């Protein structure tokens, strides 16, 4: 009549993930006009360790194509990426490591 | 009298006219909130029967109940 461990795991409180020191959501950059029709250049700032992820992450600081601000995206660091490497993203971007394209 | 013409027109809900009007409004009413003020009765005619006079102080809400 006691609930099994898996059923208790589904609830939360105790079996939830420890997301305190997690260095952020590893996601790509959002699609816009500078992704779909051409490319955009953004520099790799620093390869970083995410607690609770085997692979490292990369703070790749792109220039904002619309605003005066400068945007920063947490990519999954490709093997052979380094700091100050130019990573180009979009349709017309080249086919080499880190260089994301559709 | 205008009301009797709307009366039997609301009894042919199966009609081509009312399979459009009850279908495109049932679209419209899902996109508005669960419980909000209607500016008027959708049916002036039906609200006539149930005692709604169209004077100041009478309020008509349009609320949805999950089926």
């Amino acid at each position: 009549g006691r609930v099994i461990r898996g059923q208790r795991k589904g609830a939360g409180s105790v079996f939830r993930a420890h997301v305190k020191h997690r260095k952020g959501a590893a996601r790509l950059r959002a699609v816009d006009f500078a992704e779909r029709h051409g490319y955009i250049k953004g520099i790799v700032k620093d390869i970083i360790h995410d607690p609770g992820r085997g692979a490292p992450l990369a703070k790749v600081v792109f220039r904002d194509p619309y605003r005066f601000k400068k945007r920063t995206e947490l990519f999954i660091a490709a093997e052979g990426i380094h700091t100050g490497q130019f990573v180009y993203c979009g349709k017309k971007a080249q086919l080499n490591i880190g260089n994301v394209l559709p | 009298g205008a009301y009797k013409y709307i009366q039997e027109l609301w009894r042919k809900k199966q009609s081509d006219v009312m399979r459009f009007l009850l279908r495109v409004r049932c679209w419209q009413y899902r996109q508005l909130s669960a419980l909000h003020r209607a500016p008027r009765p959708t049916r002036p005619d039906k609200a006539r029967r149930l005692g709604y006079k169209a004077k100041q102080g009478y309020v008509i809400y349009r609320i949805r109940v999950r089926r």
């Binding site: 006009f33 490319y39 194509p65 | 027109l9 081509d16 459009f20 679209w27 419209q28």
Partner: protein, 225 residues
Amino acid sequence: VVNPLFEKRPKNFGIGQDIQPKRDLTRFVKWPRYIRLQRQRAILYKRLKVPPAINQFTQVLDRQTATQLLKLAHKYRPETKQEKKQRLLARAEKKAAKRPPVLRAGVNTVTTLVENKKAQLVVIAHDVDPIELVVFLPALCRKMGVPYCILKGKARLCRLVHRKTCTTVAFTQVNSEDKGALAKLVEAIRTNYNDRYDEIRRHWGGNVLGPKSVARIAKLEKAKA
């Protein structure tokens, strides 16, 4: 004369080369839920196979004829709230010391004089929101031989009466002088609605796709020829 310092300093709005200018984003705005709602209602009217009892309020009296009917309908203003007081000073002149013709407003006091045949013409408004108030009325006037005409605006028909909106407007009897204009309005109305109502009954609205979906069919026609 000229200043050689005044230099052309142009911008290169190519992708990535320079920042983008403050250009038109009106058609990429996240609109309020009510503005989005009323717009893609007007769109569903253009897609869904609208039945011809509702579509007959798209066949409207044109620009040139509408103002002619309003011109004669402006003669027949039902009296103002302050014009009401000016009749009961012409009263105790005769006591202490016939009526002129007007418009008849609303759906009740029109449709009670369509079966009665006491309307020489009916003026329908096209944008009654709970449409069922009027849907029957174009059909009603076809049977009783009253010429019905449909206008663009219930507010502008509500201007003739001293109110916000008015659904329908009828002509009972008119001034014996001004029968000519009233009778010539009938022939252009009677021969554009009543003489061809069986054509209006087989007249379906909507069933027109999006203009980029319509413009993709053209691509699939220009590839096989």
